[PDB]
Structure formats: C-alpha cells, structure tokens
Amino acid sequence: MPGLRRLTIRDLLAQGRTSSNALEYVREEVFTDITFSKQTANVKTIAHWVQASRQVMDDAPMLQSYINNRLMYGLALKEEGQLLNGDGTGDNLEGLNKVATAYDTSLNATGDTRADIIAHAIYQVTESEFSASGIVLNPRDWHNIALLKDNEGRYIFGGPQAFTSNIMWGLPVVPTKAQAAGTFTVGGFDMASQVWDRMDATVEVSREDRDNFVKNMLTILCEERLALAHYRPTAIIKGTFS
C-alpha cells in the first residue's frame, strides 16, 4: 500500500467509495439564497509506469523496493497533482483550482502582509456559509509564511516548529510542489469536495509491450480509478500573492 510522511491533498477532502463508471450530484451555488444545479463526476484513471530490467527484478526482493520507492511514490505525487490542477477534459480530473473561486482583490489594503491576505481568504471562504478547514501552498511560499516578523522581535506563526508542514492558525497546511509559486488555495475542503475511489492502486507487470520482448525489459504499471465531486465551489478560494 502507498503512504507518505506528510499531509496529502486527498486527506483534506472527504473520502467515499463508488462502484460505478460515474455518479450524479447537486452543486450548491451561492450568490454573493442558493440555487442548486445538476452535475456529474466520471471515474477517471491515473497511472504511473516505469521500465525495468527483467531478471534482477523478478528474482529478488528488489521488486518490493522498486514498486514502493518509485511506483507508489510517483502515483501519489501524480494523483496529488491531478486533484489540484486537473482540467476535466478527456482523462483529466477537474482539479480544485479549476472550479475554485477567484480571490477578491478588494479585501487587501496598503501595508498588508501575507498573513493579512491569508486572513482575507479565510474570510472569503466564509461567504459560502462554510468554514475554512485547509490551506494548500508551495513549499517556498509556506517557508516564507512560517518565518516572518511583525515589525518587532515577536514571531507570528511558529517558524521552525510549525513550518514542518504542521498547522497554521489551526488549519492544516499542505505544502506541495504541484501548487505554483505565489499561489494559495484556501477552503473548507472538508465539506466542499469529495473523492470517490472506484478502484485501489493496483500494480501489474508487462513482459510483452512496445518492443519489450526483444529489448529484454519489463514495464511495471500502477493505476487507480477515482472521481472528484465539487458540491460548493464557492467554498474554495484560489489567490495569488502580491
């Protein structure tokens, strides 16, 4: 099974299990009364594959190492990028940043810091009757945020005790390289989106592939099928730092 020593984007979202090629649902639109709308989520597949030598790998304990440290790791890093930046066209999921709501750049005044913009965004999330539960950042941006002062020796956030992923103002932070530099995504992901797992990550070996029989190598493939549903896109705010 997979697993990383860090909070992942799918941990922020709600988890469900589905047994169909698609599922329909209702999207709550709020005007800043709520008007409902019909939506559908299609179960799409994310895969990661690597080429490998034949004999050393099917006759050694270097296979568990090879799929654990390359395949599951890459597959996780790929689903994390899909859930956050998917397009929704073809085999692409529709990511949080695709449906997210534009940050309102009228909430920031002269002299604002990054903490002020984070506060403005945690606000703008509240305009959906939902409470912000998670933040998604770039590791560079998260490092800059965790370590800044307040025109005084005092020390907002916790720096190198809270910078270690950890939390910020009570909300979990996911610092991920999938997130562009200078871009933040705040929201109540707990009750604004949901990932439905059709099939768990499965691994398979292809001896026969695109001229693999004559090249003396295998292809190892790890794949998983899931869908992403966005109940209230107004609960997600995607913004850019100054």
Residues 98-127 that bind a second copy (CB under 8 A): 109, 111, 113, 115-116, 118-120, 122-123, 126-127
Q: Which of 62, 102, 180, 199 binds a second copy (CB under 8 A)?
A: 62
d(CA 202, CA 148): 44
Q: Which of 149, 199, 200, 202 binds a second copy (CB under 8 A)?
A: 149
Q: Which of 1, 36, 106, 242 binds a second copy (CB under 8 A)?
A: 36
Closer to a second copy by CB, 99 or 145: give it: 145
CA-closest candidate to residue 42, choices 56, 25, 23: 23
Q: Is 89 in the site for a second copy (CB under 8 A)?
A: no
Q: Which two tokens stand for residue 91?
A: 């085999």
Q: Is 200 in the site for a second copy (CB under 8 A)?
A: no
Q: Is 31 in the site for a second copy (CB under 8 A)?
A: no
Nearest distance in Å: CB 101, a second copy: 15
Note every long-range contact of 89-93, with CB atoms under 8 Å and residues 24 or more positions apart, other chains counting.
91/44, 91/45, 92/44, 93/44, 93/46, 93/226, 93/227, 93/228
Q: Is 34 in the site for a second copy (CB under 8 A)?
A: yes
Q: Which two tokens stand for residue 192?
A: 């604004």
Q: Is 233 in the site for a second copy (CB under 8 A)?
A: no
Q: Which two tokens stand for residue 111?
A: 């002299």
Give the footprint of a second copy on residues 175-194 (CB under 8 A): 175, 177, 188, 190-191, 194
* 67-73-78-79 Cα dihedral, nearest 10 degrees: 100
Q: Is 63 in the site for a second copy (CB under 8 A)?
A: yes
Nearest distance in Å: CB 183, a second copy: 14
Q: Is 69 in the site for a second copy (CB under 8 A)?
A: yes
Q: Which two tokens stand for residue 222?
A: 């790890």
Nearest distance in Å: CB 100, a second copy: 19
Q: Which of 18, 97, 101, 234 binds a second copy (CB under 8 A)?
A: 18
d(CA 23, CA 43): 8
Note every long-range contact of 214-217, with CB atoms under 8 Å and residues 24 or more positions apart, other chains counting.
216/53, 216/54, 217/51, 217/52, 217/53, 217/54
